[PDB]
Symmetry: D2
C-alpha cells in the first residue's frame, strides 16, 4: 500500500515549528513536532494551528505536537532543532538521539543545532548509524544569505546567483568566490573587490545580523528553508549537489571529522562527498577551519 513519508522535527521553537509547517505545506509527509513535556501544550497548539491552515492552503498532511517520542515511531527522516556551553547542546544531542534511534532505527537525521560540526558528530556517534544517514545543515544557509546579498548588489533574481561554501559559519566559513557566479559569470568579474569582500563578510556575520535585529532568539525562516531543501533532496531522491556538514574519511586529506563540504544529497542521504582541487589559499583557509573544528571536538566529553 502507498503511504506518506513520516518526518519528525525535534524542537518546537521558531526554527522547528517553521520547518514543520514548510514540510506539511509541500506535502512531503506526515509531520510530528516534538519538544519537552514542560512545553507540551504550546507544541500541541502550534501543530494544531498548522493543521487548521491545511484546508485553506490546500495541502493533505497530518501534523501533531507531542512530548512522547513514541509518536515519532518509524520516521523516515528526523530533523534535530533542539538545544540553546557546547556540552549544554552535546547532552541534549545525546538524550534526543537515544529516544529518536529507539522508535525509528532506519531513519535519516539532519542536525541544525549549533555548533553543527560537533553536534552532528555527537548525533553520529550516539546513533551508531552509517555516515550517510547523519547530516548537519550549514552551507545552504550561508549560501542563501550570500545569494540574497549578491542579488541585492546586482539587482537580479536570486534564482541566478550561486555561492560556494566549505566549512561552518562566521570565521570558520571557507567561501570559494571563484565558484560564485551570476548567470554563470564569475562574481569577481561583476562586483568590485571592496563590495564583494563586504558580502563574504556580511555572510560570515549573517546569523548575528539577525540575532542583533530580533533582540531575543535567532534566525528561523532561512534556517527552516535550508533544512527543508535538504529533507526534500532525500525524500524525493533528487541527488542535489548541496553543501552539507558530512563525516570525512580521507576527503580533503582529513578523517574522523564532520566538516562543511559539497555533497550529493539523495535517497541514501550523503550519496558521496565531492572532492575539489582547491588553490593553495583555499587549502590554507580550509586547514585553519578544520583546526577550529578539531578545537570544538576536543571540547566534547
Amino acid at each position: 500500500a502507498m503511504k506518506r513519508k513520516k518526518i519528525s522535527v525535534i524542537g518546537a521553537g521558531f526554527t522547528g515549528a517553521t520547518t514543520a509547517f514548510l514540510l506539511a505545506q509541500k506535502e512531503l509527509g506526515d509531520v510530528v513536532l516534538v519538544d519537552i513535556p514542560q512545553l507540551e501544550n504550546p507544541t500541541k497548539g502550534k501543530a494544531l494551528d498548522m493543521l487548521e491552515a491545511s484546508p485553506v492552503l490546500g495541502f493533505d498532511a497530518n501534523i501533531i505536537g507531542t512530548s512522547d517520542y513514541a509518536d515519532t515511531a518509524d520516521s523516515d527522516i528526523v530533523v534535530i532543532t533542539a538545544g540553546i556551553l557546547v556540552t549544554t547542546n552535546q547532552k541534549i544531542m545525546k538524550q534526543v538521539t537515544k529516544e529518536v534511534v529507539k522508535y525509528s532505527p532506519n531513519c535519516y537525521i539532519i542536525v541544525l543545532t549549533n555548533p553543527v560540526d560537533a553536534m552532528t558528530y555527537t548525533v553520529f556517534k550516539e546513533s551508531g548509524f552509517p555516515k550517510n544517514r547523519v547530516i548537519g545543515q550549514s552551507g545552504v544557509l550561508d549560501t542563501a544569505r550570500f545569494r540574497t546579498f549578491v542579488a541585492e548588489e546586482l539587482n537580479i533574481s536570486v534564482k541566478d546567483v550561486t555561492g560556494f561554501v566549505l566549512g561552518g559559519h562566521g570565521d570558520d566559513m571557507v567561501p570559494l568566490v571563484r565558484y560564485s557566479y551570476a548567470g554563470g559569470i564569475p562574481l569577481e568579474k561583476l562586483i568590485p573587490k571592496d563590495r564583494l569582500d563586504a558580502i563574504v563578510e556580511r555572510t560570515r556575520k549573517g546569523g548575528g545580523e539577525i540575532v542583533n535585529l530580533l533582540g531575543n532568539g535567532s534566525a528561523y525562516y532561512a534556517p527552516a528553508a535550508s533544512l527543508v531543501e535538504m529533507v526534500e533532496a532525500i525524500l524525493k531522491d533528487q541527488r542535489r549537489i548541496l553543501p552539507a556538514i558530512a563525516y570525512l574519511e580521507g576527503e580533503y586529506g582529513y578523517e574522523g571529522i564532520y566538516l562543511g563540504v559539497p555533497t550529493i544529497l539523495g535517497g541514501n542521504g550523503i550519496e558521496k562527498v565531492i572532492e575539489l582541487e582547491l588553490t593553495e589559499e583555499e587549502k590554507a583557509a580550509l586547514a585553519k577551519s578544520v583546526e577550529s573544528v578539531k578545537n570544538v571536538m576536543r571540547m566534547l566529553e
Copy 2:
C-alpha cells in the same frame, strides 16, 4: 512596464509575520512588514530572515521591514493585524493605522484581522472614506478552516473534499449552516451522528480559545495567516471566489449600517457582492442574535 503587486502587512506579530512570509512564498508581490518604532529592528530582522529564505525556497519576492508608513506607498492591498475597552483601545490603533495607510495608498484594498473584527473593520471603513467593496474583515474562512479540519479528522478524508458554511463571527456569534456543509457533496448530517456533529460545531465555536489556551501566551497565527492569504489572492488574481467575509450591509439579510460575517464574491474589485440566502426561521433568529452582539460592540465605539 510590468510591475509587481505591492502588499503591506500592518502588525509584525506572529500572524502579521506568518502572512508576509506566505505572500512572498506564493510570489503574490513585494511585501512591506510594518510595526511601531519601538519594534522597528525586530521587524527588519524578521523581514530579512524571510528574504534570505528566498534563494532556497526559490521565490522572487522583495520583503522589507519598517516602522515608516511611507514604505507602504502605492500598496495594492494592506492587511491590518495590529492590536492586542479592548474595543475602545483597538479603535484608536485602527483610526491611527488607517489614517497613515490611506495617505500613502489611496486606492488600496484593506483586509482587517484585528478583533473584534466586526467593530474594527467598521472603524477602518468609516475612518478610510473608501467604498464598502474595499474594506473587508476576515472571520468565516478561519472558522470554516477549523470546521473542515475537524470534519476531515472525523471521516478520515482529505480536507479538500469538506465544505463548511458560516455566517456571522466567532464563538457564540457564529451562525453555522450544517445543511450547507458537505463531504464530497454529501450533507454531513447524513455522515456524522448528531452528537459528534454538534461537538464539531461547538469545537469550531471555541477553536480560537483552544489555541490561546494551549499556547499560554498569544493566539493562533498559522490558520489566521492562511485565511488572510486566501482572501488577498482572491483580490490580487481577480478569482471571484465565494468566501465568507466581514462585509458592510446596506439591506442584505434585512440589516444595514453594520459589518457582518456573510458569504461574498471576492474578486479584483474586492467584495463584488454580498450573497443573500433564503434562511429558515431558526437561522434568521440565530443571525438576529449574532447581529445583536455586533450592534452591542459598535455601541462601545466613540
Copy 3:
C-alpha cells in the same frame, strides 16, 4: 532507501503524453511512456522532449519512452490510455472487441512486470474495458479503477463557473454512471460555495448545462475535426493518480467494481469512492431519489449491454 514512485503510462497519443508530462511536472514519480514497437521512436522522442523541458520548468522527474514492458517493472501505478476510436462503418461490437483485445494484451504485460501495481483505465468504453483489465489482471477490485466521472464533473464545473462568473474552485458537480446518455448527474448535490445550484441557476439554463456536460466529449470532437479531448482527460487521470500516490483519501467519482453497492454486482459503474493508498478505500452508497434510481438502472442496462459484446 527513499526511492521515487514509478508510474507507467500505456499509450503515447495526446492523452497519454499529456498525462506523462503532468505527472512529471508534479514530481509525483519517474514516468515510463509505453507504446507499440512500430511507434518506439515517436514514443522516445516525446519522452525526451518532456525530459528536456524539466530544467526550464524545474522538476526532478525521469521520463523515458519504450516498447519494452520490462522497463515498467515495479510500477506503483499504471495508467492505460491505449485503444481505438470508431470509424464510419465499424459495428458497436467491433469497437468493443478491438479495444477488449488491446486491454488483455496490455494487462498481461503490466501484471507480469508490476504484480503489485494499481491500474487506472481511460480506454472507451471505460466500464467494459476496466472490467476486462480487472478479470485479466487477477487483482483484487481495489487495484483496478476507471476514469469517467472526474472529467464529466470538470466540464460541468467549467460551464457552471461560466454561467455564474465565479471561480471553478467553488463549483462542485456530482455524477454517477458514465458519459452521455449514461451519465446520472445529481444537481441536488451540486453547489456554488456550498449553495445548491437549483437556488442560483434557472431550470432551463441548468438543464442546458447538464445536456452540454452529456455531449461534452462530442463538443471537443466536432471542434477539433480529428481525434478527441486530451487536456481535461489527462488532468482527470492525474487527480486520481495523485489521490493514490499521496494517500489523500479524496472523495472522487470512479468506475469501480460493484459487489452489491446500489443493488448491483458483477459490473463496473461510475460511483462516488474514497481514493487513497489502497486504491478504492470505499464505494460510497447514497440515498437516491426514485428518479435517480431509475436513471442509474437505465445506465447499468447500457453497461450490461456493452459487457455482452465482450468475447
Copy 4:
C-alpha cells in the same frame, strides 16, 4: 481594480498550444490562442479542452481560441509561434522569405490591438524573424525578444545531468548565438553545483554532449517522424514570459538586438540578458577569449548571411 495579465499565443500548433496550457496552469494571466480563420474550430476546441482541465488541476484562468486578432486587444505579452517548416523545392532563402511575410502579417495585427505589449518570437530562423517583428512593430528593442539559448541550455543541462547522475536544477549551461553550428557554448561557464564541467566530465564525453546540444532539435525531429519539439520549446518561452510578467530580472540567454555589444550593431544575436518587467533590461557583455571572439564572429556571419535573405 486588480485585473489579470493577458497573454496572446499566435499559432495553435503543438508549441503554441502547449505554451498556452503552461501559462494558464501557472495562473500568469488570461490566455488567447490565435490561428488562421481555417483552424478557428480546432483552436477553439484546444482552448476549451484546456479550460475544462482547470477545475481538476485547480487553476483559475480564462483561455479562449480565436481567429480574430480583436480578441488579442490590450495583451501585456504576445508569443509568436507561427511559421512554416521547409517544403521540398524550397531553398533556405525561400524559408526565410516565407516566414518573414508571416512575421510581418502577424506583427501588423498584434500591434494594431496591443500597442504596448512585449513580443517573444519562437519562429525560425529566430535571429532574422525577431529582427522582422522588431522593425515591423516600430517598438523599442527592449520590447521585442527571441527564444533560443534557453532551449539549448535546457538540452545541454539534461545531457550533463544524465552524465553525472545529479539534479538538472544543479547544472548550468552558457550558450551565445543560435542552434546547430551557429551555437557558441562556453563550457568554462558551465557548472554542476558551481563546479566547472571540465573538472567533472572527460573532454571526449563533454564534446559529445556539446555536439548532442547542437543536433538537439534534429534528434527530436528524427525520433518523432512528423513534426519538431514542442514541450521544451514551450517551457523555454514560458520561463521568458514569467521573467517579464513577474519582473523577475532573470539572467537568461535570449535573441536580443545589439547596438555595439560584443562589437556588433544592427543584428539580433543570442546573448546573456537581464529579463524583467521592462523586457530586455540589459545585454550583458562578457570578456571573451580570442577563440570565443572568433567563434562568435563566425556565428554572427551566419546571422548576417540570413539577414541578407530578407526582402
